[PDB]
């Protein structure tokens, strides 16, 4: 056979993929303390009874239903509006 | 004859008056300094399930 000098590597190292994404959308009731947007930078800016935390994560403050918004010269918006 | 209650287990777990096994929250000792009062007051009492089958089924004799 004869197997002379070969080698190794240094890249058998991966980052444990952490489940990230948006959980709740317009049409779903979210009631007080339900995460609904997982992200790193401001992919989704809070608003109407929406909340952010110590890691840019949107959640529910009210017992309201989600909905979205676009404001270019400001950012992307989520507004979780409830009922009158 | 006679099975034997699990000593350690007996002395380190809580089985609620309802066939539930619910113990204490682990992870409190060589930490505490660079942590929120959160991690302190929340590492108090615990819960658990699933393995409580093994816990209860091993509790036994005086049950406890």
């Amino acid at each position: 056979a004869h197997k002379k000098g070969l080698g190794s590597t240094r890249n058998g190292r991966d980052s444990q993929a952490k489940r990230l994404g948006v959980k709740r959308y317009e049409g779903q009731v979210v009631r007080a303390g339900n995460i609904l947007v997982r992200q790193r930078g401001t992919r989704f800016k809070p608003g109407k009874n929406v909340g952010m935390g110590r890691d840019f994560t949107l959640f529910a403050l009210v017992d309201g239903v989600v909905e979205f918004q676009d404001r270019g010269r400001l950012g992307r918006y989520v507004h979780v509006r409830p009922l009158a | 004859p006679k099975m034997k209650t699990h000593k350690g287990a007996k002395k380190r777990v809580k089985i609620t008056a309802s066939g539930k096994v619910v113990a204490m929250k682990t992870g409190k000792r060589h930490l505490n300094w660079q942590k929120s009062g959160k991690e302190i007051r929340q590492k108090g009492r615990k819960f658990v399930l699933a393995k409580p089958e093994a816990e209860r089924i091993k509790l036994l004799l005086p049950y406890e």
């Binding site: - | 350690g8 007996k10 002395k11 380190r12 777990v13 809580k14 113990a23 204490m24 682990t26 409190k28 393995k51």
Partner: protein, 97 residues
């Protein structure tokens, strides 16, 4: 390999001395709704002959129940259950004279 989820900490205070265990008087609780069943007197002697109690050193009254007047007999009694004894009942504390 990992601890058989034995990673759960101990909390059993006073788990182990060496001269056996501390010899203390063991109290015994009882619902006085079970009391509302029978009528007459309830001595320690009688109430182990009946259904409950069984030599539980000392008896303490408790639980729900009704305002039936009689002779309850024991040692200690619940502050809350003594409010039931109020509506109609009698209290003998700590036996022997």
């Amino acid at each position: 390999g990992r601890s058989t989820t034995l990673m759960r900490l101990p909390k059993r205070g006073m788990q182990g001395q060496v001269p056996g265990e501390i010899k203390r008087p063991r109290y015994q609780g009882v619902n006085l709704k079970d009391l509302a069943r029978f009528e007459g007197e309830v001595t320690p002697e009688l109430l182990v002959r009946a259904g409950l109690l069984k030599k539980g050193y000392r008896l303490k009254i408790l639980g729900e129940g009704e305002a039936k007047p009689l002779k309850v007999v024991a040692h200690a009694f619940s502050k809350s259950a003594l409010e039931k004894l109020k509506a109609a009942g009698g209290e003998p504390v700590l036996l022997e004279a």
